[PDB]
Amino acid sequence: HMAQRAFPNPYADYNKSLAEGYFDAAGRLTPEFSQRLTNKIRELLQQMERGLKSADPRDGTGYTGWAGIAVLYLHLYDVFGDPAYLQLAHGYVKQSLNCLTKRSITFLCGDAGPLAVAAVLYHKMNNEKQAEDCITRLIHLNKIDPHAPNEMLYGRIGYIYALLFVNKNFGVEKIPQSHIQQICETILTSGENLARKRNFTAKSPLMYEWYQEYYVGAAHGLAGIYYYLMQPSLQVSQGKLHSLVKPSVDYVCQLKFPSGNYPPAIGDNRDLLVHWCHGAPGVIYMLIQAYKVFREEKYLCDAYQCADVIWQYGLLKKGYGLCHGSAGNAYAFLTLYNLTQDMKYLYRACKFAEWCLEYGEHGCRTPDTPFSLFEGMAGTIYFLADLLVPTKARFPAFEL
Ligand SMILES: N[C@@H](CCC(=O)N[C@@H](CS)C(=O)NCC(=O)O)C(=O)O
Ligand SMILES: [Zn+2]
């Protein structure tokens, strides 16, 4: 059924000859391909700026609204060094700070996005007072939603991402580790409790749920949570890593379909969705991180299988976005490239970029938010710009 959701891939797979046009022997993009990426970025940015004039004033979130556009412009500033991008970022940050709703704690869908992005932007503009005020508010945000879920879009790991984002960008421990530690402890406790309650324990020591489904994928599910729990940033003990997280990861691995794709939720039998939010393009992060941490070959094997699924079925009729689109899917190739140093995967990313370079010419669905970071054009632009330096590329608002 995956075939129904994707365009046939029109490209030849890797060989040293097809690859030479895109990058050299060191994996460094050619000047010509770099420029073509840059040219498309500039073109799409014009369309994005115009389109955003019609966007909902009230949505300031990273996922669909203003803070997400600021994330893009902070990135473009880092890639290109044009001060105009920093200025654009400031405008979008100010809009997002007028949109706080106090309903959610995450970087992508709650108030943490505006606050964490503003903290970093203010820091980059040497505005210490504003930066520090945003950090205070970000720290205090914890208190507004105890009993949050554990997942990326609405739950604890989405809040953690915001804290990590500030610390990374300041290059200093602005948010105390003990703040991250207490959240991590709540996540682990919650997972053990639910596994115990439902008698998953023997097969999976941890279990999580969102809107009464055992979601599997990165956005709302297990793969997202375990990817986080395996991160050195969260400082989970070796003890818990081996006794709790590893067997829970293995349980997810065993959910794999014959195709190499993953179900959206435990017991959901449809092999249909090839997205970051649901399926192989989001589960691959858990696999790659599992490999880095546990060094078991099976995780790498599964990751290769993900990449092949995505190579076959990853050019989505849904469009070019990050959450569920070709650009988000392309990031799966980059993560596997960055693990293995296998240029085959850099090549596949470049071909997905080629597809995005024909933006709007395939008859794709128009997204609900056509210009946003996660559904729309801002995210496609983000990917194109990130590809410029492949070894530093990271899926935004998610990958560490
Ligand atoms: N609002 C989305 C459309 C909805 C969508 O694609 N939702 C994702 C989850 S974030 C999904 O996997 N939907 C289920 C499906 O495609 O069958 C957009 O305009 O891009
Ligand atoms: Zn999605």
Numbering used by the authors: 0 to 399
Kindly provide excerpts from the paper associated with this entry.
The addition of the thiol side chain of Cys residues to dehydroalanine and dehydrobutyrine is a process that occurs in all domains of life and is catalyzed by LanC enzymes. In eukarya, the process is intermolecular and involves the addition of the thiol of glutathione to remove electrophilic structures from the proteome, thus preventing dysregulation of cellular processes. The addition of GSH (C-glutathionylation) removes electrophilic Dha/Dhb residues from the proteome. Previous structures of NisC, LanCL1 (23), LanCL2 (20), and the LanC-domain containing CylM all show a characteristic α,α-toroid fold with a zinc ion bound at the top of the barrel by two His residues and a Cys residue.
Prolonged incubation revealed that Cys264, located distal to the active site, appeared to form an adduct with GSH. We therefore determined the structure of LanCL1-C264A in complex with GSH (1.79 Å resolution), showing that the structure is near-identical to that of the wild-type enzyme. The mutation of this Cys residue to Ala only moderately affected the activity of the enzyme. Hence, to rule out off-target GSH binding effects, all mutants discussed in kinetic and binding studies are in the background of the Cys264Ala mutation.
